[PDB]
Structure 1
Amino acid sequence: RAQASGEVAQTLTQADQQLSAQGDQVRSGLESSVDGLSAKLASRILGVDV
């Protein structure tokens, strides 16, 4: 029980470094996409091709 619990605790630190590294990359990729998605959203707000 103590060994399996200790391995889960260290595994959560391994996930935190993976997800923060991949999250910082993927938020940069999405900043390109969101400018394109925003132009569609403004056309839905107005009802015209802004």
Structure 2
Amino acid sequence: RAQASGEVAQTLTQADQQLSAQGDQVRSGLESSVDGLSAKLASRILGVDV
């Protein structure tokens, strides 16, 4: 039990670090795609091509 719990905790810490790094990495391309996403959203809430 204790090894299972220790292994789970270690992998949880490692996964937290790795996934946090991966998320902020991908947020970079997120801020690129945001421009097009917002343009198309505007062209929807307006009902005509922006």
**Given the two structures, how large is their TM-score scaled by the length of structure 1?**
0.92
Moved >3 Å (runs of 4+): none
Separation in 1 of the partners of 2:45 and 2:2? 56
Give percent identity, aligned residues only: 100
Q: How many residues were matched structurally?
A: 50
Structure 1 gap segments, 5+ residues each: none
**Given the two structures, how large is their TM-score scaled by the length of structure 2?**
0.92
Structure 2 gap segments, 5+ residues each: none
